[PDB]
Design a protein around this ligand. Structure first.
Ligand code: HEC
Ligand code: HEC
Ligand code: HEC
Ligand code: HEC
Ligand code: HEC
Ligand code: HEC
Ligand code: HEC
Ligand code: HEC
Ligand code: HEC
Ligand code: HEC
Ligand code: HEC
Ligand code: HEC
Ligand SMILES: [Fe+3]
Ligand SMILES: [Fe+3]
Ligand SMILES: [Fe+3]
Ligand SMILES: [Fe+3]
Ligand SMILES: [Fe+3]
Ligand SMILES: [Fe+3]
Ligand SMILES: [Fe+3]
Ligand SMILES: [Fe+3]
Ligand SMILES: [Zn+2]
Ligand SMILES: [Zn+2]
Ligand SMILES: [Zn+2]
Ligand SMILES: [Zn+2]
Ligand SMILES: [Zn+2]
Ligand SMILES: [Zn+2]
Ligand SMILES: [Zn+2]
Ligand SMILES: [Zn+2]
Ligand SMILES: [Zn+2]
Ligand SMILES: [Zn+2]
Ligand SMILES: [Zn+2]
Ligand SMILES: [Zn+2]
Ligand SMILES: [Zn+2]
Ligand SMILES: [Zn+2]
Ligand SMILES: [Zn+2]
Ligand SMILES: [Zn+2]
Ligand SMILES: [Zn+2]
Ligand SMILES: [Zn+2]
Ligand SMILES: [Zn+2]
Ligand SMILES: [Zn+2]
Ligand SMILES: [Zn+2]
Ligand SMILES: [Zn+2]
Ligand SMILES: [Zn+2]
Ligand SMILES: [Zn+2]
Lengths: 106, 106, 106, 106, 106, 106, 106, 106, 106, 106, 106, 106
């Protein structure tokens, strides 16, 4: 899918995690965020469209999705041990990673 | 396979992309280039054979294949939307990545 | 599994490689080390528990497991060609990578 | 998933169909709408929560999702024949079915 | 496939059931009739092409295929118990269902 | 299987749901009731054996199993969210559906 | 499942074998008895609950299910050769095995 | 298959093991002997046809196949480590097990 | 694997069961103990290396692993019902079985 | 199926290829013709029923289906490259192969 | 396997077909003869060992196995329709094909 | 793929067989040559483009690929028995088959 629809999936499933009361809801929402972040890792943002794909802008862009994938995988590891409150607090810390990318490329 | 045969697969399938007229030929050639670049990422070139596997030469070598994998994945994303001319121009830009590695390790 | 049990798998299977006499034992022990290193890449060590997940400590920690995964994949490539002595000497070189991480985070 | 999230999937994927330019985007969005409508067929709306599950309100509710499933299946049949404009006009006619259910149960 | 080819499959396989002498022929012909009736359930006949898909004509059309699917499933249940004469007489009763639909929409 | 054995499966698994204390027992008993109700939907009861398969008795018989399948699917949806008491109370409401069918066809 | 429900499956499917008239009914009932006897082999009866799991009571209990599994497998071997009367008489001989266990542990 | 054909498979594949020169021939012949010994474990020999299936003859018969299965599994364990001479000498020791059963039941 | 490595798997996973706090850790550790006990059932201990494989020492050795497999299967049955304390106390009783084998063959 | 029904499949799907307007219809009709020609290759025509299966009539009969299979495979190769007009003209040339067999054996 | 063992499979399974009384025995023996004839089609007989693989002896050898494969496939087609006597008489006609090859190459 | 790319696969993998030192390289190169020769069997060479597909030129063309497939299958049979020198000498004999086809159709 597009980069814009992959951001629809990350935004919608993150709001379902804060309101969840069981561990099946948190575990299923974190699996869709993992698949949407891997599809968006190779894309090109509209503000870097006239650059070459070897640029230091396109190197820092791909390094930001690989930090997000490692944090989604760590929060999914807590949800499989049925630790709902620990997995919900780990997903709240995701917003500092995706505020730092919006200041540069969004 | 060897590093030498993985370079046979990348070179042969790239010449079939420039002469293709349908979107099934471009989509099938980009899938073989993706599998050959992942097998070659862990190999050791003959000009770095007497180094240790923690070297800053063996760190820049593996960083060059991971930039190529992200560009093959982006060109395969355009070919599945049946955009043949956009996927052919993205594969022409691959040659700047693999001219910069040949000056250092080939 | 935990970070502590993933270190049990890497330590036990490495001692079986030095005493092996056939190529089926070396090839099966290197496959379990590959799966245990990928599960441990996203974890948090106890000495970095009060840091944020965007830290330059948590960036150098994940860069150390990705260097180990590339060396296990290269030694598994020699074991499938039935080169037992070359795959055993490549697994002995793994100890320099995992002595440098124990000085900083263990 | 909930009834509320199944309505998030139907609303988001319908807006991607009107702006699509290829037949792979239309065919993939209609497949997610088919799976979200089948999961929502058995649910209970909040305005019928104090009824019994044998009611003539809960009979007309389930008859409305089965009319929608037959229209999504017919529009997916046109998209597999690469008829993009015919499948886009069939998805615009879906809004009369889901305006008649919102007047009674939403 | 089209509505016209799905009627080719129902007509041809019904004539093979009356002339069959073993239970493997009857069981294989009833499986193709089941798959052709489910593909035709969502289609639009040419005499209802200018109606809306919420019509009481398009509601009685889909109710007629769902009565046929339940009769094919019951005759396939007798053929798996190796009751050839009971499954052949149940397939002869199918013609009253598909004479009543031809008077209205064919 | 027969209609009589499909009623053995619905009756036995319903009594195990009222006495269950964990969510794995409720989730496994509701899956067998779903498969037994779909096999019985196409059958013919002994009190309608001399009717034709287009009758308004055989239309109300198949409409009664389709209401039961939607209630088993809704109770299985609560059991996967580990809501044991809500799924047990939804299975108690199933008895009004299957008292109304026994007054007419049993 | 429990030990009590595994005895529900053995008792119900044995009564369907004596009344069967085709070889598909006998072959399907003997397959469910095979799966229910293997799940019950490791269980603990309520009259041996305060023993240790190394007892000579718990050794004779597990030896009785392993004699029953070999007799169900032999009767299923006759049913696949379409020998219905030989497989029905072999299932009648099962009752001497399960009268000898009820005198000691039931 | 029959008891007589399962003895055809054990006799033919044992003579191919003594004449083999590679480890693929020994490993493939020992896999067919494992499947033929498990199918024959539940059978009834012609010299015990008029006994009951709870007899001490039918208990010593099944104990003899379970000793053979453990010896075939141990010889297959040596063949996967590419130890051809050790796996060939372990298959020669199988003949003492199957001379002791022929004196009693053949 | 060897007999010595199968004892590494049983010893390590048993110590993780006593310190576990959730039911996913207990259920995953009991599955690895089940696979390691079945691979070790056919092996030969070093203190019985000069015996024949029909010995009454090699008959009591294989009878000891089959008692352990039935106790691991019973403790895994409690862990799937999310009964953590009952499955932890059943795994503590395993040590009497494996103290009696070490006095004779270790 | 019979030889007569395999000729029903070849005749019906060939008339759908000349009237097709997309490449999904041509590609799906050529796949059913490939499976029907392979099932008919081993059959015996009614005009050669009293011959032996080593005859020079039964050798020229099987050589005629093997020429047809190679022409269906070549036309299916053009349809996967989305060349509809080239695949439709290749299927028109099939009629010379199946006019030459009807003059001798039909 | 070898050419000699593939002739062991064809000879043993042909003698089980003449003595069979059900259709499951004939259908299972004809499936093993089909797999053994395809493995032997590419082999080289010992009396043609010093020829080149382009010889007119090695062309008539491969043409003889391809006539046998078509006769085994035709006899397996009768066995799936539960025609035991027709499939047994078709397997008796196989001996004329394999007497003509033994006069030239055996 | 094209006929020209299928000749790229046969030419490249044949040169890797003469320089190989293990049996995994020879076995993997012979598997790609088998798949490329089956895709090229149905193609049309450019020097026979204006012929009809029933010609005696197009009959001798398809007979030449079927002789090559039988020689690749025989050399792959030696490589699975770990006979590297016998499989390398069998692949050298392939060049006489593909010199005789180049004199007529290339
Ligand atoms: C860069 C490394 C990013 C990370 C990590 C995340 N996002 Fe993102 N976001 C990024 C870009 C370049 C864009 C614009 C691309 C475009 O064409 O839209 C966005 C956009 C969004 C949006 C707006 C969607 C829209 O309809 O325009 C949303 C709602 C959004 N992003 C959400 C979001 C969140 C919550 C993230 C953290 C978990 C996140 N994104 C990651 C770049 C990057
Ligand atoms: C480094 C990061 C590389 C990238 C990206 C690509 N190649 Fe490569 N190439 C590299 C090395 C170290 C070598 C020598 C290894 C050896 O032992 O051969 C090569 C070699 C080639 C060759 C020559 C093959 C031969 O037979 O010797 C070719 C034809 C080749 N490379 C092609 C190629 C192309 C077109 C690439 C860009 C898409 C490419 N390679 C990537 C290092 C690296
Ligand atoms: C960092 C990048 C590491 C690499 C690479 C390896 N190890 Fe490790 N090790 C690391 C940490 C942070 C820890 C402590 C975590 C904890 O909570 O235990 C460890 C620990 C070990 C242990 C001790 C296990 C225990 O019971 O405490 C062992 C035996 C061990 N590590 C082995 C080991 C080896 C041999 C490695 C090289 C192949 C290796 N580990 C990799 C960090 C890192
Ligand atoms: C009944 C038979 C419906 C059909 C068909 C569709 N919808 Fe629906 N919708 C329905 C209900 C009962 C509700 C309220 C349930 C709740 O608890 O939210 C809704 C709600 C929506 C919403 C609001 C989502 C929210 O966050 O509250 C949207 C955006 C929505 N529905 C969209 C939608 C569209 C576009 C449909 C046609 C294709 C459609 N729904 C189908 C009942 C029914
Ligand atoms: C409606 C609920 C139907 C049922 C049940 C069956 N058929 Fe049908 N049939 C129907 C329509 C609307 C049409 C015309 C559609 C078109 O465009 O052709 C048909 C047509 C046929 C045909 C003619 C095929 C042709 O080439 O034109 C045949 C041979 C046919 N139908 C057979 C058939 C039989 C035997 C059925 C009972 C088992 C049956 N169909 C079901 C509507 C409906
Ligand atoms: C009709 C729409 C039914 C629904 C829903 C349920 N049952 Fe049923 N039941 C039905 C019939 C027509 C029959 C008689 C068929 C026969 O030949 O037996 C039955 C019978 C039973 C029985 C008796 C079984 C026996 O051995 O005779 C039982 C125990 C039974 N039914 C249980 C049952 C329950 C509890 C249901 C609700 C969940 C239920 N059935 C559904 C018709 C219908
Ligand atoms: C021991 C080795 C047994 C064999 C073989 C069979 N059964 Fe069993 N049975 C056994 C026990 C220990 C129990 C009591 C366990 C409990 O908690 O219920 C039973 C019970 C039954 C029952 C009663 C079920 C109930 O609701 O209480 C039945 C109907 C039953 N058993 C049937 C049965 C038959 C017919 C068997 C032979 C084929 C059989 N069981 C095997 C112990 C053993
Ligand atoms: C009992 C516990 C046995 C073991 C272990 C083996 N065999 Fe057997 N064998 C057994 C019986 C009861 C019979 C007679 C059954 C019958 O109806 O044929 C046999 C027979 C044979 C035969 C003769 C086959 C024939 O055509 O009659 C052979 C060639 C044979 N057995 C071989 C064989 C070998 C070599 C075994 C050791 C590995 C072996 N069998 C195991 C009983 C038992
Ligand atoms: C016999 C029937 C045994 C059972 C049940 C268990 N073990 Fe074992 N153990 C057994 C033998 C014959 C041996 C020696 C084999 C060898 O060559 O090592 C062992 C050894 C061990 C060891 C030592 C491992 C080592 O490195 O030498 C351990 C740690 C061990 N066994 C643990 C263990 C436990 C805890 C068991 C109960 C659950 C158990 N084993 C089962 C024989 C048998
Ligand atoms: C021989 C090598 C054949 C080829 C190639 C094709 N057909 Fe055939 N055809 C053949 C025979 C021996 C028979 C008679 C068998 C019988 O018992 O019917 C037929 C028959 C037909 C029929 C008539 C079907 C009927 O109901 O009788 C049709 C419509 C038919 N064939 C069509 C057909 C076409 C169009 C083919 C070319 C693509 C074709 N067949 C191939 C022998 C052979
Ligand atoms: C050639 C085209 C053959 C066909 C068809 C069949 N066989 Fe064969 N057979 C053939 C050869 C070249 C050989 C000798 C190869 C060798 O090294 O053994 C054989 C041998 C046999 C044997 C003897 C086996 C042995 O142990 O030596 C048997 C029992 C045998 N063949 C049986 C057989 C039957 C019954 C066939 C018809 C169905 C048949 N083979 C096919 C060549 C050919
Ligand atoms: C006919 C029966 C052939 C066999 C067997 C092999 N080849 Fe071929 N070859 C054939 C043709 C008709 C053509 C020309 C087709 C075209 O359009 O190119 C070829 C061509 C080649 C080439 C040239 C590739 C190119 O880029 O033009 C090569 C390198 C080649 N063939 C290699 C080759 C080898 C080594 C073969 C033996 C194993 C072989 N081919 C088989 C016809 C036939
Ligand atoms: Fe980096
Ligand atoms: Fe080897
Ligand atoms: Fe209705
Ligand atoms: Fe015993
Ligand atoms: Fe839980
Ligand atoms: Fe297209
Ligand atoms: Fe039958
Ligand atoms: Fe020929
Ligand atoms: Zn995507
Ligand atoms: Zn979207
Ligand atoms: Zn490789
Ligand atoms: Zn190469
Ligand atoms: Zn893990
Ligand atoms: Zn551990
Ligand atoms: Zn849902
Ligand atoms: Zn949502
Ligand atoms: Zn269709
Ligand atoms: Zn048609
Ligand atoms: Zn059924
Ligand atoms: Zn029953
Ligand atoms: Zn159970
Ligand atoms: Zn029960
Ligand atoms: Zn068998
Ligand atoms: Zn036999
Ligand atoms: Zn093992
Ligand atoms: Zn170990
Ligand atoms: Zn067929
Ligand atoms: Zn037909
Ligand atoms: Zn073989
Ligand atoms: Zn043999
Ligand atoms: Zn191809
Ligand atoms: Zn090429």
């Amino acid at each position: 899918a597009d980069l814009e629809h992959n951001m629809h999936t990350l935004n919608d499933n993150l709001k379902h995690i804060e309101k969840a009361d069981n561990a099946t809801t948190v575990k299923d929402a974190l699996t869709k965020m993992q698949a949407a972040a891997q599809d968006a890792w190779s894309a090109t943002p509209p503000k870097l469209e006239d650059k070459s794909p070897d640029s230091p802008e396109m190197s820092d862009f791909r390094c930001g999705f690989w930090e997000l994938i490692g944090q989604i995988n760590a929060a999914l590891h807590l949800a499989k041990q049925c630790k709902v409150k620990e997995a919900q607090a780990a997903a709240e810390q995701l917003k500092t990673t995706c505020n730092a990318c919006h200041q540069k490329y969004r």
